[PDB]
Amino acid sequence: MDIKINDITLGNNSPFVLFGGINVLESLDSTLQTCAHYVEVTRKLGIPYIFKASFDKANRSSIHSYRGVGLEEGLKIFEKVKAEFGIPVITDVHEPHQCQPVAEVCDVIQLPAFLARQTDLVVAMAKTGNVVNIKKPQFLSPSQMKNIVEKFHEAGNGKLILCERGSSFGYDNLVVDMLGFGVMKQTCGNLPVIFDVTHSLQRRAQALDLALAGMATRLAGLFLESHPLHLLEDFLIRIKALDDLIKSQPIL
Amino acid sequence: MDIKINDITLGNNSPFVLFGGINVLESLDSTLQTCAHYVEVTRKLGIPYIFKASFDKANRSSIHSYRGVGLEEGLKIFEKVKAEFGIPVITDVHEPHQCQPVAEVCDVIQLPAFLARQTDLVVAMAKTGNVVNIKKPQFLSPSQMKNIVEKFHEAGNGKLILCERGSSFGYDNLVVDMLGFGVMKQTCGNLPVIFDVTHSLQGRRAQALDLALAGMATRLAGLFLESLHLLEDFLIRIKALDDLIKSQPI
Amino acid sequence: MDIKINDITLGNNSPFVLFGGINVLESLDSTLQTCAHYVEVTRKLGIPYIFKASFDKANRSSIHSYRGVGLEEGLKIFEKVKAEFGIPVITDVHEPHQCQPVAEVCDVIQLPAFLARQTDLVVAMAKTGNVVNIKKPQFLSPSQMKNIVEKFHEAGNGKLILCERGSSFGYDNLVVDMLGFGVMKQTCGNLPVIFDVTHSLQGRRAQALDLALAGMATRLAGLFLESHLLEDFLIRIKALDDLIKSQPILT
Amino acid sequence: MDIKINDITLGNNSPFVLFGGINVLESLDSTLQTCAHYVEVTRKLGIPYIFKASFDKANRSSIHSYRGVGLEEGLKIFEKVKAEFGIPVITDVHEPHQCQPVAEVCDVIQLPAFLARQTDLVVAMAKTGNVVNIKKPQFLSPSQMKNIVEKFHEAGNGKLILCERGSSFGYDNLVVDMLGFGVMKQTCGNLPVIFDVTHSLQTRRRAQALDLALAGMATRLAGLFLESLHLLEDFLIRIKALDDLIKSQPI
Ligand SMILES: [Cl-]
Ligand code: NA
């Protein structure tokens, strides 16, 4: 099942889509500059691109580290990104009250892994009618994603994306089970599956190996965060090379 | 470090405190019925007791499944429970705005395991000044608990209980690492550590007993559960072990 | 199911048995010294005691680490330990051909975790008729122990002990599942279950004590060490064990 | 570091080598039927190929299982394979005495995962000077493979292949950490790293094995290790397609 996000086709058998940007919206000029560079590189390589950032990072390293610009200023920044570059945007939501105002501006709204089973937030997100990215919790097995998917379907929304970010592996460590992608495809109606390589890690050699491994299984998209910015092009050339190959061959 | 909750002394070298009650509050009458049972068994065995309940099921089976009586109704029931039995109570909170009004009624407020890293909830809970129970996430190392403790401490609240609930073990399984209790005690300033045996699980009663005794053998401040006279039989054995452990020099 | 080892009763509802000693046998004099210390401490507390050592260690830290005195001298040393102290002994075997001669002297023969599924060894061990200690591999679930037990039964030996050593938990780390003991008792006919607390670590003595107490709280036939510190430790284990064993299994 | 095996160059930046065949040798006629199929498919695909088989199943299902053809007959069959086809072969060895006589014939000798820490077997395999395939235990982290490599180097053999087979993940389940390939490259002097996709999966279909094989080979590996109306050929066309692409990109 494919999902149209403006003029982009997202699907497990379509050219991969890059979800990328910055961790926290900190500033207007810096967000536009970072986005500009993603846009330049992705346009150069013909890779569909969705800009990603959080306006309210609810899980932070210290209690007083900057949470981000907040809802109202964040949505203004997202508006400017869309106007300037003509691209879709993605951001997370943490409270039901945020869902409507965020969905009015943003093309994809994201369900944070730690809130993945909060029924109130799931219903509130489903009822926006927006395309939704479901972050798979590290403590949740790939077969348990259909339970989240069914809660969205009950509440009236089937425009869902499932996002791998790794699995708990002993203490303080993550492993990405490459078979999980297929389990999610076969148990959740072949909805688009994307891979958050950044949060699946802990290094640029690791990210590349892990991204290539993932994309070899035939995925709708790759999800990353950047600070290295200038090595983006070399990275994407490799991802595109593998994706073009995999996608050019019929499924067996 | 000990924590006083009314006339109960909670701490890792004190007689263990039982935390128990129901999953989610449905009605006044069934709530008072469950609590009376717990008070009856715990009084005759001489075990300090704190009643536990959630006013909301945050993760429902269905979009249209029953959720619980909610905040305003839940709090009224907790006020009744306290009035009738004169015992402390504990409930979990899921949104920052809920923290202060829950804290007015409930002696201990609980940080759910999924929300343990929600910085706004941590602050709001800390602001209340109430005793806080921190549910250790199944995906978090015991040595990482010190980071959650630090945040409560920078938010001005040191009345913290650390609660074990097992660790992710492959897919859809949990294991309890008995060494984690010790790591938490050493790294988090000997705050009271309690063991949620109920959530650490998923002959099934025999399992809870083996697991509870193994946990309590490491010297814990309390035992946390949801649950012939099966509670009685269980607690008689736990108290015997706890009495022995706590009578040995550290 | 109980197992008689000379005058010792080993079982999940009998007073715990201590298994311990030295890593590898070097000399008669050196062995008698360590053994004598274990014997004196355990005798002082009335804890039954089985002395453990390897005569030929297959899984050494380095290629050229001393392997031990070897079969012939090793067995002479075990014979002396038995005569001097009147206690049973335990040793690992890793080749089928050594099982019979070792079983002439050693009361309990031990199957290394890494050879737990080597059918040849299992059969050679079974055929001795001796009590056998099966070390559970860290990658084997407690519900798989039944299969090892079945292979010993097929080979004519039911006198088996199951030895817990921990489970792989991510990379490097081991975790001991306290529920595994129960699963093994329930699925393997209540064969005696012992707890190798030392391997299970990785150690700190504080950690050893917590982990040992936790496991013994589940009601176990014995405690296995790969080791007045021993006295203080054994006093605590005995306290817990006497309490647990004194109470009826849940009604 | 590359390794020459007859006319095959094995290395993490060379075209992948297939290590392929069966579980155990049963008949000489049944073995040639399998090998001939592997050879014709790989030759037309231009994939270098090494024939794999065991001469003994050391972990029987029951005590009364089909162990296999045995050593004496096995070596004769491997002879016949190398004469007929002109390819290298690989097999596992489980006892130190077997190593030199097996290495006289079999180009690559394999350290079973369960015996990874058997020091006598490591030294015996090392001493043959043959290329050695090290099966990574499901319980060993990739950071710790360097310890086995260390022992082989110390015993004087550097022609080592590292074979990934998955990692213990909870009970009775395996996960393959795609990052471990890189860890092993970086910590073990860039020795050839191969991927046993078959064993990595036997706790979970061709669809599965393909996804997993493609993911692993995407990390740039020296080879693929497997077991088994034209499924191998179709499967290998897809692997070669990805390998060719990956190997043509600069590191
Ligand atoms: Cl031992
Ligand atoms: Na929208």
UniProtKB/Swiss-Prot annotation, chain A:
Annotated signal sequence range: none
The keyword Transport appears for this protein: no
Keywords, in A-Z order: Cytoplasm, Lipopolysaccharide biosynthesis, Transferase
A Pfam family matched in the record: DAHP_synth_1
Pathway assignment: Carbohydrate biosynthesis; 3-deoxy-D-manno-octulosonate biosynthesis; 3-deoxy-D-manno-octulosonate from D-ribulose 5-phosphate: step 2/3; Bacterial outer membrane biogenesis; lipopolysaccharide biosynthesis
InterPro entries named in the record: Aldolase_TIM, DAHP1/KDSA, KDO8P_synthase
Record-annotated disulphide pairs: none
Any one GO BP annotation for this protein: keto-3-deoxy-D-manno-octulosonic acid biosynthetic process
Gene Ontology cellular component terms for the protein in this record: cytosol
First-tier enzyme category under EC: transferase
Subcellular location(s) per record: Cytoplasm
Entry's EC annotation: 2.5.1.55
Source taxon at top rank: Bacteria
Keyword set includes Cytoplasm: yes
GO molecular function ontology, one term from the record: 3-deoxy-8-phosphooctulonate synthase activity
Family to which the UniProt record says this protein belongs: Belongs to the KdsA family.
The protein, known as: 2-dehydro-3-deoxyphosphooctonate aldolase
Organism the protein comes from: Neisseria meningitidis serogroup B (strain ATCC BAA-335 / MC58)
Curated annotation (Swiss-Prot), chain D:
Family annotation (HAMAP family): KDO8P_synth (MF_00056)
Protein's cellular compartments: Cytoplasm
Reactions accelerated catalytically: D-arabinose 5-phosphate + phosphoenolpyruvate + H2O = 3-deoxy-alpha-D-manno-2-octulosonate-8-phosphate + phosphate
GO molecular function, one term: 3-deoxy-8-phosphooctulonate synthase activity
InterPro entries according to UniProt: Aldolase_TIM, DAHP1/KDSA, KDO8P_synthase
EC main group: transferase
UniProt-listed GO biological process terms: keto-3-deoxy-D-manno-octulosonic acid biosynthetic process
Pathway named in the protein's UniProt entry: Carbohydrate biosynthesis; 3-deoxy-D-manno-octulosonate biosynthesis; 3-deoxy-D-manno-octulosonate from D-ribulose 5-phosphate: step 2/3; Bacterial outer membrane biogenesis; lipopolysaccharide biosynthesis
Domain of life: Bacteria
Gene this protein is translated from: kdsA
Keywords: Cytoplasm, Lipopolysaccharide biosynthesis, Transferase
Transmembrane regions listed in the UniProt entry: none
Similarity-based family: Belongs to the KdsA family.
Naturally occurring in which organism (per UniProt): Neisseria meningitidis serogroup B (strain ATCC BAA-335 / MC58)
GO cellular component, one term: cytosol
Enzyme Commission numbers on file: 2.5.1.55
This protein's name: 2-dehydro-3-deoxyphosphooctonate aldolase
